[PDB]
Amino acid sequence: RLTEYSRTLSGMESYCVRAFADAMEVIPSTLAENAGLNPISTVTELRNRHAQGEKTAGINVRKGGISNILEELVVQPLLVSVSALTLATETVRSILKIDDVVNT
Amino acid sequence: NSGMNPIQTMTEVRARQVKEMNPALGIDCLHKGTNDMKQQHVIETLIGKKQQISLATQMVRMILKIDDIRKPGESEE
Amino acid sequence: ALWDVESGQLLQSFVLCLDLTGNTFVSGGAMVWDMRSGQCVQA
Amino acid sequence: MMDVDHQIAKLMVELSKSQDDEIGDGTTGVVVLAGALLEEAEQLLDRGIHPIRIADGYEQAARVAIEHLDKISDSVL
Amino acid sequence: EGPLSVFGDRSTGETIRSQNVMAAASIANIVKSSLGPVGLDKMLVDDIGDVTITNDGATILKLLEVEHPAAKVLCEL
Amino acid sequence: RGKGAYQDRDKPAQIRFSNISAAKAVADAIRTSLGPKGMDKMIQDGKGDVTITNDGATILKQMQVLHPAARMLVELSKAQDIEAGDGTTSVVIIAGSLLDSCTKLLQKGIHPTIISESFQKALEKGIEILTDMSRPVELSDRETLLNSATTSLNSK
Amino acid sequence: ASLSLAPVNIFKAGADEERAETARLTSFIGAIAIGDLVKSTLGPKGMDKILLSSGRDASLMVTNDGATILKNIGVDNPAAKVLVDMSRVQDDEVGDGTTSVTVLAAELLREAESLIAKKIHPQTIIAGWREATKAAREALLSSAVDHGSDEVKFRQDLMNIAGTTLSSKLLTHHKDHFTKLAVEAVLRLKGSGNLEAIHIIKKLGGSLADSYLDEGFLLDKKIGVNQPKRIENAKILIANTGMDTDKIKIFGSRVRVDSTAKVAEIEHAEKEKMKEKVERILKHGINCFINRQLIYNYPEQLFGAAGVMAIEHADFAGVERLALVTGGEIASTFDHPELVKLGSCKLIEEVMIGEDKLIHFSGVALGEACTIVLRGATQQILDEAERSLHDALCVLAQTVKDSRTVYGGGCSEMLMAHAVTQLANRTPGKEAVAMESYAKALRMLPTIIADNAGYDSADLVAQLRAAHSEGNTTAGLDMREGTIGDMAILGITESFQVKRQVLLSAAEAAEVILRVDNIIKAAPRK
Amino acid sequence: ASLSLAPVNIFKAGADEERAETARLTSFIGAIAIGDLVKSTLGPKGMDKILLSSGRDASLMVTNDGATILKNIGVDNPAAKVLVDMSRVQDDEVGDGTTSVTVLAAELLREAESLIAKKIHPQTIIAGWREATKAAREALLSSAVDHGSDE
Amino acid sequence: FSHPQMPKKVEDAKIAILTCPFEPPKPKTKHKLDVTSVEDYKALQKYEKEKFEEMIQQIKETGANLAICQWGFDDEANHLLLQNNLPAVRWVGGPEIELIAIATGGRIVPRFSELTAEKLGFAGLVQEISFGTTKDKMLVIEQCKNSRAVTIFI
Ligand SMILES: Nc1ncnc2c1ncn2[C@@H]1O[C@H](COP(=O)(O)OP(=O)(O)O)[C@@H](O)[C@H]1O
Ligand SMILES: Nc1ncnc2c1ncn2[C@@H]1O[C@H](COP(=O)(O)OP(=O)(O)O)[C@@H](O)[C@H]1O
Ligand SMILES: [Mg+2]
Ligand SMILES: [Mg+2]
Ligand SMILES: [Mg+2]
C-alpha cells in the first residue's frame, strides 16, 4: 500500500516513501530466512497474494509456504505494530536530525 | 561533481533518452545549455567503455566469490 | 545522600568526607546543609 | 600511491592498473562502477540471494550492455 | 571489531554450536569412566593437598573448576 | 542558476553514514532471533553472569553497545517494551531497515529533512492502513486471547 | 625584552606566557572554533549534535541548545572559556539566544582579527564597536512593538514567539501542538515568573505528539496501605511535619527509670502523643493529607482507620506545587484549624501512565502550577524535548514580564546593521572601518541562518540589505521556501529582551577578549 | 563513508588521509603560513631573516631572498612544499620575484579560503581566476614599454 | 524568606535582628534531662510547645514586621511565623547581620526575652529579588533612614 501511495506522490518525496515501503518489506524476508524458506520467492508470493485481494496471508512455518495466516491462529494486537512503526519512525527522524558528534 | 541535483538531472536525462530515441543525451557538466553530448563533442572510445564494463564485472564476480579470509593477524612491525 | 534506616528510603540527595542534632551537617571536598530547609547555609 | 592493507583495496588498485595498462583512460570509472556493483550486491545479499547468482546476473547484464554499446557506437575517421 | 561495535567477542552458528557440544562432551567424558559396577573412583586434589577420593558424579562436578557456560549447565544439572 | 550551494563540509554526511551503519549492524545482529524459527543468544557479562534470551530488549540491554546510534536503538527497544511489551525485536529491525534505505536516499542527493518529512507522511499512511486492516476484539472471547498468547510464546 | 624570551628564566617549570601575536592568535582561534562549533545549529534548519561523555558512565546527549553544547565540552582555551561563560550567563538571564550570542561574538572577533591584520589599534576597534553598539541598541529599541494592552493580540504574539523559539528544536515536528501546550502552561501561571511551578515529567514510550499538559496536576508519590485510592470533592491539607517518631526537640532528654513497666508506659505515652497529633490533624476536617517528610506505619494506620488519603515524602518542590495548584497552606502546627486554609480539588485518583502509577488531581481550585507529560521513543528524545520546552517556557515568561517584541528571521539584525552602517557613513577615521566590521558580523548572523538551510545566502542577505535600506523595516527571511517576506505577516516575532541581551552580551564579550594582549599561564597542578 | 571513518580500516600503520574540510584547511594554513613568513622582506623597507641551521655544521645565513628562506626550511605541509617549489622555479627562471610570487600565491589562496567559506565551488573560483589571469596578462602586456633601439 | 508562602515584599519594616535560633533552649554544659514517668513526658511535650508559642509571641509583642535570624529555625517556628504575619529570613551570616543592624539602626538581640521595641531596626522596603530563569532569590534591604552602611550590586 505504501508503494502505491508513493506512486501517487510524484516528486522528490515519492522516492523516500518507496524506500520506506521497501524497508517495511524486510520483516517478512527475515521470517522466510529464519524459517528455512527461499526469501525472495516467498516474499514475491506474499506480495502477489496480497495484491490479489487477500490480506490475511503470511508465512506458514508449519506448512512451509504461504497460506491464510488466520488458519494457523497467528494473531497479534494492533497496538504492537502501531507502536513499533511509530517509535521506529520517530527514532529515525531524530537520528536524521543529527550531523555532528562532540566528545566531552 | 558539477553541483547539480543527481537524481533529478539523471532522471530527466533518462526520460528524455526514452522519449526521443537519442542515446547521445548525457549530463551537461560544463553548463553549456544543452544535454546533447554529440553536439558538445564529448567523445570517448567504445573499446574503453567495453573494457571498463568487462573489468568491473570480472572483479566484482571475483570479489563476490570470496567467502573466507585467513590473515596472519600478527600485526608485525 | 542521607537515608532513613528504619524505612529504608532516601530522605534527600545533595564530597570526600562529611560529618554532623541530626539536622545540620558539614561536607568538605566547607558546605553546611540544613535538613529543615534543604539548602546550603554556610561556606 | 595509496598505502593499504585490505586485500579488496589491493584488488581495486590492481583493477585500476589493469584498466590503465589495457586502455590508458577511464581508470577512475572502473573503480566507481565496481563500488556501485558491490553496493547493490550488498542489498541483494541481504535478501537471501546466493552471491554466485548475483555474479551470474551481473555477467548477463554486462553482456547485454556490451552488445548495446556495440549497437550505439559511431565510427570516426 | 567491525560495524557492530561491541566490546567483546562474538561467535555465531556452527562455531558456537560446536563449542557448546565440545564443552558438554568434556563434562561427560570427565565422569564417563565412573559408571556401573565396573566403574572406578577418582582422586581430586584441592590445590593445597586436600584429597577427595570419590565416585559420585555430583561431588566430582561440584569440586571441579568449570568456566564454560554449557559445562556449568551440565554441572548444575 | 546551475550550481547550488557547494556544501564545503562533508563531516555531517560522514556522521550520518556512521550512524546508519551502526544501526544497520545492530539490526543485522538481532535479525537471527526473529519469529518462531528464531534462536536464542547467549550473553556473558564482564562479571561472568550468563543469560540466554530471545527478547529483543534484553539482548540489546545486555550487550554494552558503544556507538551512539546503537544506544538510541537500545532506548527505542526499551520504549517499545514499556509501551507494548512485545515486538521489541521488530522495532529495532524496522529502524535499521529505514536507516539502510536512508543511506541510498542521501546518496541520491536528498536533504535529510525531506527524508524525515516523507517518512512522517509514510508513517501516517501506514498507521491508517494498519488500522483499516485490523478487526475489533472483545475481552469475553477467550479463544482470541489464547491465540494471542500462543502467538507471543511461539518464538520463545 | 620579553618575559619568556630573555636570557634569565623568570617562571616556574610549566608556566609560560604568550605575547602579542601568540596571545591574539590563541584568543582568535579559540573564539572562532567555539563559534564554528556552536553554529550550524542555528535557525529553523539547524541540526543537532551528539555529546559523548568520556567518563565511566559515558552519558549520551543529543541536543540543539548552544549553552548545553558549550557546557559539556572540555575547553582549555581561555577565550573559549570566556565565550562558554557568556553563553551560560545568557541562558541564565533568558531562555533562547544562547547560540546567537556565541555566533555573534565569534563573528565580531573574526572581524577584529581581520582589522588587526590591517594595522588598526585594538583600542580604536573598541571605540568604534562601542559607538556601533549604541546605534544598534537605539535602533532595536525604536523598532520594538508592544501589544500587552490587547489580550487577543498579546496571545497571538505569545503563540508566534513560542513557535519561533520551537522552530529550531526537535519539537518543530509538532510545533503547533507544542506551541499551544507551552502557551497554555505559561498562561496558567497567572503572571508569576516561577518556572519551577511548571513540572515536566518524562515518560518513555509513546509518541511525541502524545505529550500533553494535564488539566490538573500529577504527583509521582504513593498512597498509604489502608488509605482510600479515590477521593471526590477532596479537602487537602499540605503539611511539613515530622510524623516519623516525632521526638521532642529537647535533645538532652532521656528516659531514666528503674523498671521495664515504666519503659512500656513511656512508649505508650509516645504512641498516644502521635495519636493526638493525628487527631489534631483530623480536626481540620480533611480528606487528603500531603506531608513533605515521611509518614511512618502508626500515623498511616491511623489515617487509614480515619479513611483519609495520606501522601508522604512529597519534597519541598512537591508541596510548593501542590499549594500553588490547590490553594492550601503548608502547615507545620495544628493548634488553630481556623487559621489554616485547606486546598481543594474536584477529584483525586491514581492514573496509569506507561508502566508507572501516578496520583492525579483533577478540577483543581487555583491551578497556578502545571505538570507536563512528555512521551518519546528514546531517553535522548525526552531530554531534548524537555530542554526545548524549557527554552519556550523561559522565553514566554520573559515576554509576559516585558511584552515588547521584535521581528525575527534576521530582520532585527538587518535593521541594527543598517543603523550601524548609517552611523559609519558619517564617521571619519578607522572607527568607521570598525563600525563596518560590526555591521558585517550583524549581516553574517542571518547569513549563517540562510546557509544552514542550503539557500543562496549571499543573494538573500543582499536582498534583505536592499529592502532595509529602502525602508522596508519588517523584511526578513522566509524560511518556508527560501525567499524574503514580511515578518509581521508571517508571524516571526521574538522577545525584545532576548535580542537586546544577545547584542549587548556579544559586544561586551568581544570587547573583553579584544583587550587582551598577553596570556600568562601558571604551572598546572598535574 | 570515507576510508578513515569506516568500521573497517584500510591503511597501513601510520598512513592516513584528510578529507574535504581537513585537506582544504591544511593546504590553506600551510600556504598562508609560508606567505606570512616570506613577506615583511618585500619592498624597499623589507627586513632580513636569520637562518640558523640545526645541523652539525650549524651554518648561519642572513638573507632577504624569498627563495633562499623558503628552500632552507623543513616543511611538512604539502602545500607549503608546492609554494617552496614554485619559489625555487621562479628563482631558476629569473633572478627576482620569489618573494612576490610566494606572497601573491598566499594571498590568492587566502581569498580562495574566504570564497569557499561563502559556499562557492572551487571550480567556479578556478574559472574566474583563469579569466582574471588572462585579463591581467593582457593589461600588463599592453602596459609594457621598450627602449632597446635607443642606446 | 523562610516560608515559600510568606509575602515577598515588606514596606516600613520594623526588623528584629536575632542571633538565637528559633528552637527550644539547650545549655552549653553537658546536660541530661531525665524522664521518669508519663507525667514527665507530658510536661516535656507541653514545655516544648509552650516555648515555641512563647518565643513567637515575644517576637510579635514588640510590633516588629520582619524577623532576621542567624542560625535558622525548625518547622513549627516557621509555621508560627507565617501564621502571625511575620516574614522571616534564616541563616543570615554574621557580617550580614552586623551590616543589617548598622544600616537599619537596630540592635542585635541575643535572645527573645531581651527583645524590645527600641532595639528594632527600620527599613523602608524589604524585597525579594528574582534574576530571570535562574531560580535564585536575593533579599534587598534599603530605604533606611540614616544608613551608615552601603552595598554595591554589580
Ligand atoms: N520560523 C522562522 N523563520 C525565520 N527565522 C527563524 C524562525 N525561527 C527561528 N528563526 C531564527 O533562528 C535564530 C536561532 O534561533 P534558535 O536556534 O531557536 O535559538 P538561538 O537564538 O539560541 O540560536 C533566531 O535568531 C531566529 O531569528
Ligand atoms: N625603490 C622602490 N620603490 C618602490 N617600489 C620598489 C622599489 N624597489 C623595489 N620595489 C618593489 O618591491 C617589490 C618586491 O621586491 P623585493 O622586495 O626585492 O623582493 P622580490 O623582488 O624578490 O619580490 C617589487 O615588486 C618592486 O616593485
Ligand atoms: Mg579520462
Ligand atoms: Mg513476540
Ligand atoms: Mg532558540
From Swiss-Prot, chain B:
Modification after translation (UniProt): Ubiquitinated by the DCX(DCAF12) complex specifically recognizes the diglutamate (Glu-Glu) at the C-terminus, leading to its degradation.
Induction statement: Down-regulated in response to enterovirus 71 (EV71) infection (at protein level).
Binding site for ADP: 28, 44, 49
Assembly notes: Component of the chaperonin-containing T-complex (TRiC), a hexadecamer composed of two identical back-to-back stacked rings enclosing a protein folding chamber. Each ring is made up of eight different subunits: TCP1/CCT1, CCT2, CCT3, CCT4, CCT5, CCT6A/CCT6, CCT7, CCT8. Interacts with PACRG. Interacts with DNAAF4. Interacts with DLEC1. Interacts with SPMAP2.
Function: Component of the chaperonin-containing T-complex (TRiC), a molecular chaperone complex that assists the folding of actin, tubulin and other proteins upon ATP hydrolysis. The TRiC complex mediates the folding of WRAP53/TCAB1, thereby regulating telomere maintenance. As part of the TRiC complex may play a role in the assembly of BBSome, a complex involved in ciliogenesis regulating transports vesicles to the cilia.
Family to which the UniProt record says this protein belongs: Belongs to the TCP-1 chaperonin family.
Name assigned to this protein: T-complex protein 1 subunit epsilon
Protein source organism: Homo sapiens
Complete-protein stretch covered: 465 to 541 of 541
Swiss-Prot record, chain E:
Phenotype upon changing residue 37 to L: In IDDPMGS; uncertain significance
Binding positions (ADP): 36
Binding residues annotated for ATP, in chain numbering: 36
Consequence recorded when altering residue 6 to L: In a breast cancer sample; somatic mutation
Highest taxon of source: Eukaryota
UniProt-annotated location(s): Cytoplasm, Cytosol; Cytoplasm, Cytoskeleton, Microtubule organizing center, Centrosome
Modified residues (Phosphoserine): 5
Reported disease: Intellectual developmental disorder with polymicrogyria and seizures: An autosomal dominant neurologic disorder characterized by a broad phenotypic spectrum. Main clinical features are developmental delay of varying severity, intellectual disability, seizures, and polymicrogyria. Additional variable features are non-specific pyramidal or cerebellar signs, and visual impairment.
Oligomer and partners: Component of the chaperonin-containing T-complex (TRiC), a hexadecamer composed of two identical back-to-back stacked rings enclosing a protein folding chamber. Each ring is made up of eight different subunits: TCP1/CCT1, CCT2, CCT3, CCT4, CCT5, CCT6A/CCT6, CCT7, CCT8. Interacts with PACRG. Interacts with GBA1. Interacts with DLEC1.
Family the entry assigns: Belongs to the TCP-1 chaperonin family.
Name the record gives this protein: T-complex protein 1 subunit alpha
Underlying gene: TCP1
UniProtKB/Swiss-Prot annotation, chain F:
Residues bearing the modification N6-acetyllysine: 3
Phosphoserine carried by residues: 18
Subcellular location(s) per record: Cytoplasm; Melanosome; Cytoplasm, Cytoskeleton, Microtubule organizing center, Centrosome; Cytoplasm, Cytoskeleton, Cilium basal body
Coiled-coil annotated spans: none
Residues binding Mg(2+), per UniProt: 86
Residues engaged in binding ATP: 35, 87-88, 156
Residue(s) carrying Omega-N-methylarginine: 1
Positions that bind ADP: 35, 87-90, 154-156
Function description: Component of the chaperonin-containing T-complex (TRiC), a molecular chaperone complex that assists the folding of actin, tubulin and other proteins upon ATP hydrolysis. The TRiC complex mediates the folding of WRAP53/TCAB1, thereby regulating telomere maintenance. As part of the TRiC complex may play a role in the assembly of BBSome, a complex involved in ciliogenesis regulating transports vesicles to the cilia.
Similarity remark: Belongs to the TCP-1 chaperonin family.
Subunit structure: Component of the chaperonin-containing T-complex (TRiC), a hexadecamer composed of two identical back-to-back stacked rings enclosing a protein folding chamber. Each ring is made up of eight different subunits: TCP1/CCT1, CCT2, CCT3, CCT4, CCT5, CCT6A/CCT6, CCT7, CCT8. Interacts with PACRG. Interacts with DNAAF4. Interacts with DLEC1.
UniProt-recorded name of the protein: T-complex protein 1 subunit delta
Gene behind the chain: CCT4
First and last residues shown, out of full length: 19 to 174 of 539
From Swiss-Prot, chain G:
Modified residues (N6-acetyllysine): 12, 153, 180
Class of enzymatic activity (EC top level): hydrolase
The protein's Enzyme Commission number: 3.6.1.-
Taxonomy, superkingdom: Eukaryota
Reaction(s) catalysed by this chain's protein: ATP + H2O = ADP + phosphate + H(+)
UniProt GO cellular component terms: azurophil granule lumen; cell body; chaperonin-containing T-complex; cytosol; extracellular exosome; extracellular region; microtubule; zona pellucida receptor complex
Chain residues that bind ATP: 43, 97-99, 494, 499
Keyword Ligase among UniProt keywords: no
Positions carrying N-acetylalanine: 1
Modified sites of kind Phosphoserine: 2, 59, 259
Covalent cross-link Glycyl lysine isopeptide (Lys-Gly) (interchain with G-Cter in SUMO2), where: 247
Modified residue annotations for Phosphothreonine: 260
Main location: cytoplasm
Binding-site positions, ADP: 43, 97-100, 167-168, 409, 494, 499
Matching CDD domains: TCP1_beta
Annotated compartments: Cytoplasm
Keywords from the named record: Acetylation, ATP-binding, Chaperone, Cytoplasm, Hydrolase, Isopeptide bond, Nucleotide-binding, Phosphoprotein, Ubl conjugation
GO function terms (MF aspect): ATP binding; ATP hydrolysis activity; ATP-dependent protein folding chaperone; protein folding chaperone; ubiquitin protein ligase binding; unfolded protein binding
Record-linked Gene3D superfamilies: GroEL, GroEL-like equatorial domain, TCP-1-like chaperonin intermediate domain
Similarity annotation: Belongs to the TCP-1 chaperonin family.
Function: Component of the chaperonin-containing T-complex (TRiC), a molecular chaperone complex that assists the folding of actin, tubulin and other proteins upon ATP hydrolysis. The TRiC complex mediates the folding of WRAP53/TCAB1, thereby regulating telomere maintenance. As part of the TRiC complex may play a role in the assembly of BBSome, a complex involved in ciliogenesis regulating transports vesicles to the cilia.
Protein's recorded name: T-complex protein 1 subunit beta
